Symmetry: C3
Subunit: 314 residues, 3 copies
């Protein structure tokens, strides 16, 4: 199956900028080139051009509503289009807000998808529960069917229609959840593996169960949304909300490695890589590089080594 890289240089989902430079940093680290060398066809769609909506008045507490909604609508169109053509979409964020566009668009072509959310956060706050109107913490609230009508309509999101139910999303790496968000995941009965579960079961058992839970009765498309802050700050320091005690570089690669095994990866999001937040040039280099590794792992690169079939090396 061919791959379609799509850049989403957007940051209105959070206060300070920097995230819009994410895709540039990743491309500059030779993401696309390195991708080409695998058993997958690669096409770089380029970066979407986002327009700043004038006089974007804060909807109550929610900030930059119309811009984020506009951007997400434009993305969902592009995503759905490539998906329609039978390609796997790889979105380079950008902040978590863009996960609305990515998942939606993906759903229009594959309504039976499942989402595996690797993040240190749940990002399931609604316009009513947000302690800050920052939309990077609400993407999942806009997608859940069970949350339809549980919060007022936000200017710019009229086009969005809840495309997934609680029984279709699995969180991995949770370690910074708000009281409201915890009430939500508990009440709705969502399957999650926070750091304590990973500690208790080991990354192996976690993946073993997320799969039997999601791909139990019927094998369906997997949409992996990967927030770089799911790994410990010692690995991915250049992000907006780093939290200590995260997943290790090894754990991060084991996850993507098992995702490739299933052969059901349909959509991938590499979000939150903010190049201006790195304390030193090395910190940024470390962050960008680890993101690249995670992506390559998703598409065949294994740590035991690779090699072309039918070719004799001896």
């Amino acid at each position: 199956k061919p791959i379609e890289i799509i850049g989403a240089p957007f940051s209105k989902g959070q206060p300070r900028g920097g995230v819009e430079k994410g895709p540039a940093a990743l491309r500059k680290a030779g993401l696309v080139e390195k991708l080409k060398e695998t058993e997958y066809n690669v096409r770089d769609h380029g970066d979407l051009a986002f327009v700043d909506v004038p006089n974007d008045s804060p909807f109550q507490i929610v900030k930059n509503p119309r811009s984020v909604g506009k951007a997400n609508e434009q993305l969902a169109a592009v995503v759905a289009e490539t998906q329609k053509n039978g390609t796997i979409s790889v979105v380079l964020g950008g902040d978590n807000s863009m996960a609305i566009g990515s998942i939606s668009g993906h759903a229009r072509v594959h309504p039976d998808l499942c989402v595996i959310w690797v993040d240190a956060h749940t990002d399931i706050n609604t316009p009513l529960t947000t302690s800050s109107g920052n939309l990077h913490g609400q993407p999942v609230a806009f997608l859940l069917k069970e949350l339809k009508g549980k919060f007022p309509d936000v200017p710019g999101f009229s086009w969005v229609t809840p495309c997934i139910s609680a029984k279709d999303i699995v969180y991995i790496g949770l370690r910074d959840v708000d009281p409201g968000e915890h009430y939500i995941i508990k009440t709705l009965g969502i399957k999650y593996f926070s750091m304590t579960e990973v500690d208790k079961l080991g990354i192996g058992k976690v993946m073993e169960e997320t799969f039997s839970y999601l791909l139990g009765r019927k094998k369906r498309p997997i949409h992996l949304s990967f927030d770089v802050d799911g790994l410990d700050p010692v690995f991915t320091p250049a992000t907006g909300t780093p939290v200590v005690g995260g997943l290790s570089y090894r754990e991060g690669l084991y996850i993507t490695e098992e995702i490739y095994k299933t052969g059901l990866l349909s959509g991938l999001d590499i979000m939150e890589v903010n190049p201006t937040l790195g304390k030193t040039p090395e910190e940024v280099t470390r962050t960008v590089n680890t993101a690249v590794a995670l992506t390559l792992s998703c598409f065949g690169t294994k740590r035991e080594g690779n090699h072309k079939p039918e070719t004799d090396y001896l």
Copy 2:
């Protein structure tokens, strides 16, 4: 149950000072404030005033006997008093020597308690086996019943009466044990989980077994003595005896998270945080902060998130 923070700014249990500043650093990092925000009532008893015993002649090899004995006696009184009033005591050390006072005072009210000792060391040297008279390495030797009369009487400890048996203490994180101490833990048949066992079983199984061993037949009060050096020096660098290959920040939090689960925590010691040993300001900040996290974890803070009951967030 209410909480009673007690400061033990003592350091005579080891050569160089710095440890007496531990409680100041912890309070200064907002320990008490952060504690207040949980489902527990918090009362800060302040710092005990320790008097330096004049002409404290070294008892053979043991150094500062009368001072440490005096201090520990005073502490045990205070601990026992608060315990008597039905509160959970949280002692802020101070060096490991203060563990005598804390556990004793705790025992007077709850003689059926069990001690879980998270440390990189056993600290079970007796006056006869100590390679240095430093009392921070002998606390457990003064509490064990099976060691009663195995060593001469030390000036200042006449008030002490062995309160626990080998069958009531579990060590976690051992990785720097003296030949003598190893002979003692082996001969006495004490249950311990050194680093190799943690590697072999995983922190999960470790906790699972410490519990069935201790809380097997009857559920009793748990006294947690936590030496900051139980975690790797990359996490808690500001301490007297850091040893490489220790418990991770995640393993450290998993332990305390399981302790809270039992709902049997009755006494807690946060020892050995030495602010002057940090190579850089950041190193100290890291050490103090991780201690705070461990304490909050003991009292309800979970990594999956929290939230008040009866409150509707939607």
Copy 3:
């Protein structure tokens, strides 16, 4: 059984030097002294004197053929000699090329030995598959019977005779394998435990299976070839090819600890410690020290503590 330390200050197996200083650094860190304090007799054979072969023309792509061959031949003689006298050989490299000499010499006396290869690389490239003639990446290619005659004769290795079969070597910590090398280990059906397997099973299960696979039917001599780059660069930074996501200090000691348990250790190689590659003096100190720890672990030092038998400490 007595121990015989043998120094192999050689570096012609790779481009830049530094590796020849490894044995000096290790001795200087008190390796031999610390060894003496265990339940093993220690004899330091000193460092072999290697002669530089004049006009060593590059055999096609392979560089420094006659020198490495000469060096390895001389080493094999010394190894075999001490082995012959019933002693355990401990070689201090030096780059991985010297693994040919060590293993061969060892086999002449114990032809039924098994090789446990802890490394981040397979080092199984043949003169035909090497992307660089550097011989530190080909040691295992010269020892495998299944690769006999699969590549031309290299000047200087006429004395070598394949001494092990694919069913006798187990790799641990693989994470930087060339396509050719992966074709080779796959086609030949070699047992390996790359980082993904370590992540999936835990170091415990890894050792549990390497043993039943190797020491299944008959207990035979174990030859442990330990490349310092098998551990994460945060532990052993001074080496030629560090790779992120390696084994931890704990995992490294757990392995050596289980090796001692079997009581079948017959030969040990501590390779690749390059003192000039350390970014700071501390980085070198860290590297050197961790190697020393690994060695001591192999010979009885346990993290739970040790103590002499028949001696009463109470």
